[PDB]
Scaffold this active site. Structure first.
Site, PDB file in Angstrom:
ATOM      1  N   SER A   1      53.332  50.895  59.120  1.00 14.12           N
ATOM      2  CA  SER A   1      52.533  49.975  58.327  1.00 14.12           C
ATOM      3  C   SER A   1      53.467  49.300  57.317  1.00 14.12           C
ATOM      4  O   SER A   1      54.371  49.931  56.752  1.00 14.12           O
ATOM      5  CB  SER A   1      51.372  50.707  57.647  1.00 14.12           C
ATOM      6  OG  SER A   1      50.672  49.833  56.783  1.00 14.12           O
ATOM      7  N   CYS A   2      53.234  48.024  57.074  1.00 10.06           N
ATOM      8  CA  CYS A   2      54.091  47.251  56.202  1.00 10.06           C
ATOM      9  C   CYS A   2      53.385  47.040  54.863  1.00 10.06           C
ATOM     10  O   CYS A   2      52.478  47.797  54.503  1.00 10.06           O
ATOM     11  CB  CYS A   2      54.418  45.946  56.924  1.00 10.06           C
ATOM     12  SG  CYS A   2      54.661  46.170  58.722  1.00 10.06           S
TER      13      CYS A   2
END
Ligand SMILES: [Ca+2]
Ligand SMILES: [Ca+2]
EC number: 4.4.1.37
Lengths: 239, 262, 249, 260, 250, 245
Positions: free
Chosen positions: F161-162
């Protein structure tokens, strides 16, 4: 019984002598138009179908030909709903001013057609509602007259695709209308494309959402080409 | 051999009986008999009777009552207490017979007090089945249903709630109410043809196989709803409604030796 | 202590025992004990034992046998007859205890006849373990599940059985009597379902009703298999084959 | 008898040969024989050969080269024109045989010209070529290869001939081979690693694991248009799925088996 | 101009012919012509002819025969051997013409032998018919689809074949030779699928491959029948049973 | 050229640096740098740093801390206030620049106060106050997996996840409330079996991005997701027909 109900309806109609019929293209306004023709004759019945920006051209073009196909003299009249500021700005009371504009155009047409009343097909006088017709009673009597052709796709005003306060324009109405036409041609007669500026929020009966998956990408690109940036599917379903 | 010969046989057969009592389910077969009886013998000589009972829905009774009216028949509600017969109440394999005997013994009683010559039902190819005598098949009743302009019948067969319970299970007001509430919930989601089979703490849902894919979006709601109605496990029969009716030639015959194993 | 301290403790206890029998499931903990025994005492002084029984799949057994061999251990299959203890056969809450007592008594006989000093299992930081004298060296050395993961990485262990086999007993309600036929029925049904692409599955036994548990996220994939699963589980003896709308557990 | 003895047979057999050329797939079995050849004889006595052809993907070739380079072997790439044998070009049922013969004939020519005593492959047509499968002579099973691959620290290893996508009798061409290969590559990139695009001239028949066919529906139109632009007129999906018959019940597995 | 004038023209055309043979499909157009011909000339002067052949199903035949009887007509089945013409048998793009030519020559032979003045079909205002000289009174009277509907309602006509049949020839590629066996194979396959709930369907013939065309909106529903369909069409003689990703009328 | 030479390059570079501070995300690339740092220099010359911030999940942070301790590193949590930079708070297309500046300026100061020679991150082939040794050694995503398997590394975060910033349109101001709303929605979706997901924020509309190959599986969850994200404050809960990205 249906024989008792039709005697009441013809009797009530037999009083009016000259009538103008608000013709939806649906079966109930189809029953009134052809039964009115049956009792008063082609020359004393005027079928009127309204053409406006808030309903489909298809529903208009189908109803015009459906009234002749019943044998009536039929008149198209065009209403400019968007020129009422309540309708143009989609206020919550806007259904009222639209129906006020509509019934005065038909009453104004009835004044110059020498008609005694405006008739509609609700289940202005709704003589079908007066005779205690159900959807079942209208089905038996319409076949009984050999009637096979109505617009069974019940349409609502495109206003419901817009949030309260949003200004309807000719362009965003067309955009919403074109998107729903495309969705209907894929096999989804009940559908709504709700307008949220750059987002389209598609409402489908939940029982159809599985069948829809095969069209995801095509619908995405089609409604994007119509001007939406994001094309989405409401998880809540239709209404 | 023609539809006309079968209809003429039926008009002739009806005219001789003069006064008739019609067992009116609301399905396509008994509506044909009810609308034919009125047409050849007239409203004053035809009584339509619709049974109301604990084993059938209020909607089925009310939908059938209103069609005897829209066809123009004099129609009478009669209520049967099937649950007072021990064969029905304890759902023995013969309960269909005692249900039909109690049913047919009431219509004749009604036929006595209105002076009718016979009780008519709609069975096809003191109870007469004129469609069976006139050699009507399911296709013929459909054609004659159009010839008479008949558009309104109960499109999905309504069946006795008894078939939702295994043989030997005793039917109660509570377990009948549970089965009926579960089917009504399922129908309101868009599944007009549905069965909730009762297995004490297990509900076994039968759906037409062509609909099971659509059902997935409702799994969790149906699970919790039928659990609040009293089931502990809510399940979906992998065989579907009417197992084998749609299979290929090898496996419809293997499912039939399976269904006959019991 | 540090992991190095914990590993030295474990190395010493094994180096003291000189000959061992390892109860080998295939999970990460028993894989760690098996490879530490081999590293410290050598292949010739380690016997790996895998239990075979009616309450676990032939598949899980074959995977543990082959994972013990590829770790470089001499591995031995032993078959346990769990249904001959009535506590297991009558599916009471204490049946795991009588099953593990049966297991540890078979392992002690295997250690007696091959001259090992101890039976080792893979328990980390249980009454039948002690009553039979088996040793859990990972627990004595204060290993936690993180210590086990850490030491397994340092030894380059990457392949263990990830999904923990559970006994077929859980497919039957408490008290329902297990028989060879109803066990076989459930096991054949689960084996068939796993072979269709559904590794985590439960076929719960309700006499003539089979209630299939699948992860909800897989039920959409299952639709293409309704008719085959229905008829296959019917030929195994079920009258009704059903899919739990609630999903797995 | 024992894994230690099986390794002794293999070490002894290699020391007898002195210098060998090894057929290298990139799979675990040919990685083991390649790595044991290096350990018993060293780089100067071992040549790893990686085959390049129209019947396998360029990616499989490049990955096999790098695994042979990563193991420390002297690696030679030789490219075969399988389509120059008419049994292969027109896909007769024995076409596997002539493919293996042409392969072992080039390997023998390579081994002859570098002074090796034998060609080695990773087996667990060769005997016409004289090829020795030492793992098979030492009675290695799949477990023994995996046990020994871990004992020597082998962790990185890797396919069927594209011939299997074509009906028997159908002529393989450079263009229809490329068409099948690009179609399978496109499908793999949508998330379907196990797939076959079977060639039936103007029809493509896609085989997928049945458990994935539900997931696939969202791609129907894109796959149709992508495979049509690749040259098929009709793009279709086999209702039996990948490997038709293996997931059915005993009754319909013996119905689909009779039908073949 | 109006429907009444259009109806008058058709009554006139029928009164001049006095005796007719009507090519009866069962559709709305041929039902209108059959009902106006019976009304204007009487039962004894009208012959309804229903064609039975290998290129259409027995149900379409049995339904058309029975729809003509319930209208009150004398109806006779005539069976055509379409596979007899090599244009049809080898399914060239011209095969539609030679079949409609063979059909109209059978109808003239029937009309000649019963003393009819014309063979009538149900063609409306929007090739091999005018060669045999069949008359399209609906087209001559300027009937459109809306006019056919208006007169059908006013005459109490409600029962027709709402979906019309296409020749099974369209399931075969041009050049593919039609045989008694592969036609039956195609028809049993389509009958089986329709019995699963898929009324609009095509099983296209590709020798050993069956290519099923379905409306895309139904393919999700279809998955539960995959293996059953696969094995059933294999028992009908196909080796591979496939589903067109393009959908219906791909 | 070969993975062996690429690894030797990395071993030498680490021996030249002698003491390092490693920016540790928990993904495979930073897991490779962290073990190779520990393998060459030992626990005492390696400091693992895990950044804790409002724009990444508490879950990713807890896994990273415990994964680096499990790799045998001394690990340090450091907390960043990304929302205190107005470029980040108002979500301009520039905010990646000020976020990456704030992150590396914090990591260099940790390296200054423990005397390490460099900050190491996990950037691969295909921020100049940082050494991307995997990039210098020509590591590709394939090389990282081969070398990670060779060393027995198995346990990292598989789904990166960014920054939660990308769930908001450019120009939208991030708040503690709307970030928590997106975070709670994605957490719920991940708990149903969808590790790759985005809940794009459109004020009163949630637009869920899912990998298209998973959308079929999602149908069984529509109503639960609808009600749960509505209880989090969205009025309309929707699914992007385009899929993930
Ligand atoms: Ca899936
Ligand atoms: Ca559907």
């Amino acid at each position: 019984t249906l024989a008792t109900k039709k005697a009441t309806l013809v009797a009530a109609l037999k009083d009016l002598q000259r009538v103008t019929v608000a013709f939806s293209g649906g079966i109930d306004s189809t029953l009134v138009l052809k039964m009115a023709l049956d009792v008063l004759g082609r020359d004393n019945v005027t079928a009127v179908v309204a053409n406006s920006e808030l309903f489909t051209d298809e529903e208009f073009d189908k109803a015009m030909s459906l009234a002749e196909e019943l044998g009536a003299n039929v008149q198209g009249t065009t209403l400019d709903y968007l020129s009422d500021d309540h309708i143009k700005n989609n206020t919550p009371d806007s259904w009222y001013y639209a129906k006020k504009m509509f019934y005065s155009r038909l009453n104004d047409i009835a004044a110059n057609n020498g008609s005694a009343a405006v008739l509609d097909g609700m289940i202005a006088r709704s003589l079908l509602q007066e005779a205690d017709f159900f959807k079942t009673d209208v089905r038996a009597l319409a076949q009984e007259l050999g009637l096979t052709n109505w617009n069974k796709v019940a349409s609502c005003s495109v206003s419901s695709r817009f949030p309260y306060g949003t200004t309807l324009t000719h362009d965003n109405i067309a955009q919403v209308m074109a998107a729903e036409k495309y969705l209907r041609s894929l096999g989804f007669p009940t559908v709504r494309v709700r307008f949220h500026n750059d987002i389209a929020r598609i409402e489908l009966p939940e029982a159809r959402i599985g069948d829809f998956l095969v069209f995801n990408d095509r619908v995405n690109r089609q409604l994007q080409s119509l001007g939406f940036r994001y094309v989405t599917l409401d998880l809540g379903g239709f209404r």
